[PDB]
Amino acid sequence: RINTVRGPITISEAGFTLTHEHICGSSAGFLRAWPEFFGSRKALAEKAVRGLRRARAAGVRTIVDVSTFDLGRDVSLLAEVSRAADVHIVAATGLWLDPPLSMRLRSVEELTQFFLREIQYGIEDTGIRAGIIKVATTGKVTPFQELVLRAAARASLATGVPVTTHTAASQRGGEQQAAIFESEGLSPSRVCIGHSDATDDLSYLTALAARGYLIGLDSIPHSSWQTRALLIKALIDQGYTKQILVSNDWLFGISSYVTNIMDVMDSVNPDGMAFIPLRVIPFLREKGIPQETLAGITVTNPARFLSPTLR
């Protein structure tokens, strides 16, 4: 079973799953302290419901919201929009790139307890449990980020829940993440190295895939997008279809960036979270990729990844 914001589901219920998405990119406490920044909480929720309904009509059945504490995750909002759009949402623990002081000063042992409580007990007082652990690094990995990665590995080893990462692919950041995870005894099959579509260095991706890591080609419309999409085909052609995860990395509201960035983004990708099913899938089909392989990438791979496993 996979934990979602509406409770547990069987792996067969997950269906076509976008593995790296956000309802809202924000900061801890921000949505509740200043909802007017998004027009209103209601306006944000309604936009997300329409957006999720549009993705559902394009075949999407589940999204993984990889918003951590410090991205302002509001699981109550996730549960509301999930119920109204009839789209499953898996919530995340972990930490991204904006930890406040109360996180930054914690030891690896303390961070492990925090990630564990969000997986095993629930997020805040909601009873909603995280189904994935999201971490992020820059450069060669800062000392704090190393603590985060180790705590994520320890939480994953105790629960079977997978780890997914933010990298700078241009700096081949997955290599240092992989080294830390393997030092902790974490199986690569529990790890998605994310934002991997932001490089043209195929040798970097193939080597990670050959070690058993999942490759998150998760930011396709942030681009040319066809060039990014072709990395999918390249990994298929090398026989690493089982290692591929695809997503949009879209959002319905953003406060952790310049004002009005959401409008720019929406104008550049009007499909929003429907961009993968509406544009990328047809493109890959037009390039000769068969249905069975596209369904394995978008249904089978996410199911294997999210299903809690210690084998």
Ligand X SMILES: C[As](C)(=O)[O-]
Residue type, 122: G
- From the CA atom positions of the chain, what is the Rg in Å? 18
CA distance 87 to 85: 5
Which token pair is 98? 């904006």
Which residue's Cβ has the minimum distance to Zn ion? 166
Task: Return the ∠ at Cα 248 (arms to 246 and 253), rounded to 5°.
Answer: 150
Residue 222 marked as a ligand binder: no
Interface mask toward Zn ion for 147-176; x: CB under 5 A? -------------------x----------
| Residue closer to a second copy, measured from CB, 46 or 175 | 46
Task: For residue 128, count CB atoms less than 10 angstroms from its CB and return exposed for 0-12, middle for 13-18, buried for 19 or more.
Answer: buried
State yes or no: 22 annotated in a binding site: yes
Name the site residues for ligand X (rule: CB under 6 A). 22, 25, 166, 249
Of these partners, a second copy, ligand X, Zn ion, none, which one is at the site of residue 30 (CB under 5 to 8 Å by kind)? Answer: a second copy
CB under 5 to 8 A by kind: which of a second copy, ligand X, Zn ion, none does 263 bind?
none
Residues forming contacts to a second copy in the complex (CB under 8 A) are 26-30, 32-34, 36-37, 69-70, 72, 98, 100-103, 105-107, 110, 113-114, 117-118, 123-125, 255-259
Give the C-alpha separation, 179 to 138, whole Å: 15
Please check if 195 is assigned to a binding site. yes
Residue 166 annotated in ligand binding: yes
Which residue carries 């914001």 as its tokens? 5
Closest distance to Zn ion from the beta carbon of 94 (Å): 11
271 closest CA partner among 26, 54, 7, 17:
54
Which two three-digit tokens encode residue 140? Answer: 């060669």
From the list 78-86, 146-154, 196-204, 241-249, the region that binds Zn ion by CB under 5 A is 241-249
Which among a second copy, Zn ion, ligand X, none contacts residue 103 (Cβ within 5 to 8 A by kind)?
A: a second copy
| Among Zn ion, a second copy, ligand X, none, partner that 224 touches (CB below 5 to 8 angstroms by kind) | none
Task: Give the three-class secondary structure for 94.
Answer: strand
CB of 42 to ligand X, least distance (A): 23
Residue closer to a second copy by CB (options 28, 52) is 28
Closest separation in Å from C-beta 22 to Zn ion: 6
- Give me the least distance between CB of 164 and ligand X, in Å please: 10
Q: Which of 70, 118, 197, 249 binds Zn ion (CB under 5 A)?
A: 249
Pairing state between β 7-9 and 2-4? antiparallel
* DSSP secondary structure of 33-77: H-GGGGS-HHHHHHHHHHHHHHHHHTT--EEEE---GGGT--HHH
End-to-end Cα separation, the chain, in angstroms: 15
Is 134 annotated for ligand binding?
A: yes
CB of 105 to a second copy, least distance (A): 5
88 is in an annotated binding site: no
CA distances from 203 to 35, 167, 172, 178, 228 (A): 44, 16, 10, 16, 15
β pairing state of 163-166 and 132-136:
parallel
Tell me phi and psi for residue 72, to 5 degrees.
70, 20
Work out how close the CB of 195 gets to a second copy at its nearest, in angstroms, rounded to a whole number: 18
Query: Which residues participate in the annotated binding site for Zn(2+)?
Result: 20, 22, 134, 166, 195, 249
The site for Zn ion (CB under 5 A) is made up of 166, 249
Query: Which residues participate in the annotated binding site?
Result: 20, 22, 134, 166, 195, 249
